[PDB]
């Protein structure tokens, strides 16, 4: 099976960009998604990219400042968080899909990124 | 002029099956028999006319259609077949007059490490009518809960990528498919064959 390990999580100052690079095992056909848990809010989609694709759907909240790139070589997905507004603090999790049913099948444990005003 | 039939068959780029490329052949002579006997083509199934007698027919319009699909789903392009690839991407008309040709293309299109460029639709609202291309990326509201433009629960991105790795099983190997549709009528005809 495919399991993902998320790295790059830490506190940053206001407006900082922390580069979230997630190691992936088994990647190449599966699509990968980025999701976050707000302090009291259930997850809502942040970003996902299909393999070797420019097909990107973003939330309006994160529109125009977060973009993703796919190596396809080191089996990693990178998320550049640019000029994060303070209340965006959340735990970001990599996820993969097979034949999507209820939701994405595989959930990595993720990492913690919090901005500081 | 001689018909650019060869150019299309061996062309450098073939698009994904979700969004096919249609090119109109016009005012030219095409040697169908050479393609027919060649062993390059794994399937040359012809509907509405036998290939052998296709030699001397004169045809008012012929259309070139291009897509790449895996070997398992070669059977699914024919008049009337029911399946995900046939129903939600390319459906041949019930009375389609023409030939579907496919050849194994793992040597060129496939790359070691996997070629993920090709994409095929899966979850779609309603079945497409014959010859109907859909390029929409509107998230599919499969579940009752409103999708509201964001992926996730009950919001499915329609596109998914085929896993084209050179080592994969015989069934999952890449194949290159060209659909040629023919129309016969009494009028000036663009392609009249050798005669």
The shape of chain B, in one word, is: globular
Counted beta strands of chain B: 7
Q: Strand portion of chain A, in percent?
A: 35-45%
Counting helices, strands and paired strands, the structural category of chain A is: mainly beta
First and last CA, distance of chain B: 14 Å
Query: What is the oligomer described by this structure?
Result: heterodimer
PDB class: viral protein/immune system
Keywords: CovS NB21 nanobody, viral protein, VIRAL PROTEIN-IMMUNE SYSTEM complex
Assembly: dimeric
Entry title: Potent neutralizing nanobodies resist convergent circulating variants of SARS-CoV-2 by targeting novel and conserved epitopes-CovS RBD with NB21
Fold blueprint:
The complex is a heterodimer of chains A (117) and B (195).
Chain A lengths: L3 E3 L5 E2 L5 E6 L7 E6 L6 E6 L16 E5 L5 E6 L8 E7 L9 E2 L3 E3 L1 E2 L1
Parallel strand pairs in A: 2-11
Antiparallel strand pairs in A: 1-3, 3-7, 4-5, 4-8, 6-7, 8-9, 8-10
Chain B lengths: L4 H5 L11 E5 L6 H6 L5 E5 L13 E10 L13 H5 L9 E7 L14 E3 L37 E3 L12 E10 L12
Antiparallel strand pairs in B: 1-3, 2-4, 3-7, 4-7, 5-6
Protein name (chain B): Spike protein S1
Organism (chain B): Severe acute respiratory syndrome coronavirus 2 (2019-nCoV)
In short:
The complex is a heterodimer of chains A (117) and B (195). Chain A has 117 residues and is an all-beta fold.
Tell me about this structure.
- The complex is a heterodimer of chains A (117) and B (195).
- Chain A is an all-beta fold and 117 residues long.
- Chain A has no helices and eleven strands.
- In chain A, the strands form three sheets. In chain A, strands 4, 5, 8, 9 and 10 form a five-stranded antiparallel beta sheet that branches. A four-stranded antiparallel beta sheet of chain A has the order 1-3-7-6, with no helix packed on it.
- In chain A, strand 4 and strand 5 form a beta hairpin.
- Chain A is globular, with a radius of gyration of 13 Å.
- Chain B is mainly beta and 195 residues long.
- Chain B has helices at residues 5-9, 32-37, 84-88; strands at residues 21-25, 43-47, 61-70, 98-104, 119-121, 159-161, 174-183.
- A five-stranded antiparallel beta sheet of chain B has the order 1-3-7-4-2. Chain B has a two-stranded antiparallel ribbon with strand order 5-6.
- Classes of the chains: A mainly beta (117), B mainly beta (195).
- Chain B: Disulfide bonds join 3-28, 46-99, 58-192, 147-155.
- Chain B: Residues 70-72 are annotated as: Integrin-binding motif.
- Chain B: Glycans are attached at residue 10.
């Amino acid at each position: 099976q495919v399991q993902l390990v998320e790295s790059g999580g830490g506190l940053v100052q206001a407006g900082g960009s922390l580069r979230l690079s997630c190691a992936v095992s088994g990647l190449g056909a599966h699509r990968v998604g980025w999701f976050r848990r707000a302090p009291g809010k259930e997850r809502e989609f942040v970003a996902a990219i299909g393999a070797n694709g420019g097909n990107t759907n973003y939330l309006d909240s994160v529109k125009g400042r977060f973009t993703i790139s796919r190596d396809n070589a080191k089996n990693t997905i990178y998320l550049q968080m640019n000029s994060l507004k303070p209340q965006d603090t959340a735990v970001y999790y990599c996820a993969a899909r097979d034949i999507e049913t209820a939701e994405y099948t595989y959930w990595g444990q993720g990492t913690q990124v919090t901005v500081s005003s | 002029n001689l018909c650019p039939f060869g150019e299309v068959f061996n062309a450098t780029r073939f698009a994904s099956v979700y969004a096919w490329n249609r090119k109109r052949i016009s005012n030219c002579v095409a040697d169908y028999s050479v393609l027919y006997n060649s062993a390059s083509f794994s399937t040359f199934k012809c509907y509405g006319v036998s290939p052998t007698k296709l030699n001397d027919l004169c045809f008012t319009n012929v259309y070139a259609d291009s897509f790449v699909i895996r070997g398992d789903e070669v059977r699914q392009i024919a008049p009337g077949q029911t399946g995900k690839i046939a129903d939600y991407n390319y459906k041949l008309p019930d009375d389609f007059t023409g030939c579907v040709i496919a050849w194994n293309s793992n040597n060129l299109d496939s790359k070691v490490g996997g070629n993920y460029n090709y994409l095929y639709r899966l979850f779609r609202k309603s079945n497409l009518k014959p010859f109907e291309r859909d390029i929409s990326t509107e998230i599919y509201q499969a579940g009752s809960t409103p999708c509201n433009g964001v992926e996730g629960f009950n919001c499915y991105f329609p596109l998914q990528s085929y896993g084209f790795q050179p080592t994969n099983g015989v069934g999952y190997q890449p194949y290159r498919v060209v659909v040629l549709s023919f129309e016969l009528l009494h009028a000036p005809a663009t392609v009249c064959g050798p005669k």
